[PDB]
């Protein structure tokens, strides 16, 4: 529909199943609904691991870099998937979250060590 503003954004459309998510990485308007109209579907992300224990992430890089060079904004999970794939640099939020997880482990090991004695 006609909008007053908005911008092209590569995001994840949560079109899936109950207790079973499945994201469609699409490039849509920022004023459009999540599962609504889009311009062109890029890829697909399966959050749940399959029988082989792999989270299937599918990226159409040839259209992703085209829309990025045309001016498409990116979301935080999209940049996270690109950083995990290696098409984009690793996100500072992923780096700091891994550091925080390491600090939580470093606190829990000392707590479990001081609990036994």
């Amino acid at each position: 529909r006609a909008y007053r503003g908005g911008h092209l954004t590569i995001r994840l459309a949560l079109g899936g199943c109950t207790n079973r998510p499945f994201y469609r990485i699409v490039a849509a308007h920022s004023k459009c609904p999540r599962d609504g109209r889009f311009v062109e579907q890029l890829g697909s992300y399966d959050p749940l691991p399959n029988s082989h224990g792999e989270k299937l992430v599918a990226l159409n890089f040839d259209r992703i870099r085209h829309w990025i060079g045309c001016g498409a904004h990116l979301s935080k999970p999209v940049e996270k998937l690109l950083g995990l794939s290696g098409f984009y640099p690793l996100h500072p939020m992923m780096i700091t979250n891994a550091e925080r997880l390491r600090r939580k482990r470093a606190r829990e090991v000392l707590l479990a060590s001081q609990k036994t004695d």
């Binding site: 890089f61 794939s85 290696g86 098409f87 984009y88 640099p89």
Partner: protein, 49 residues
């Protein structure tokens, strides 16, 4: 240095054309200068040229 997958994309793109050059691909940073958030932005009307 480029990200790993994007660097391998160029390493496999230029290989198929017969380019034996093993030079390391670099990413330019001249036109990527960004002002900090304390830099005040102009308020005048931008003229389309």
């Amino acid at each position: 240095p480029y990200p790993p997958l994007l660097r391998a994309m160029i390493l496999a793109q230029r290989q198929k054309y017969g380019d034996t050059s093993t030079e390391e691909p670099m990413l330019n940073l001249e036109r990527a200068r960004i002002d900090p958030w304390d830099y005040p932005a102009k308020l005048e009307a931008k003229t389309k040229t």
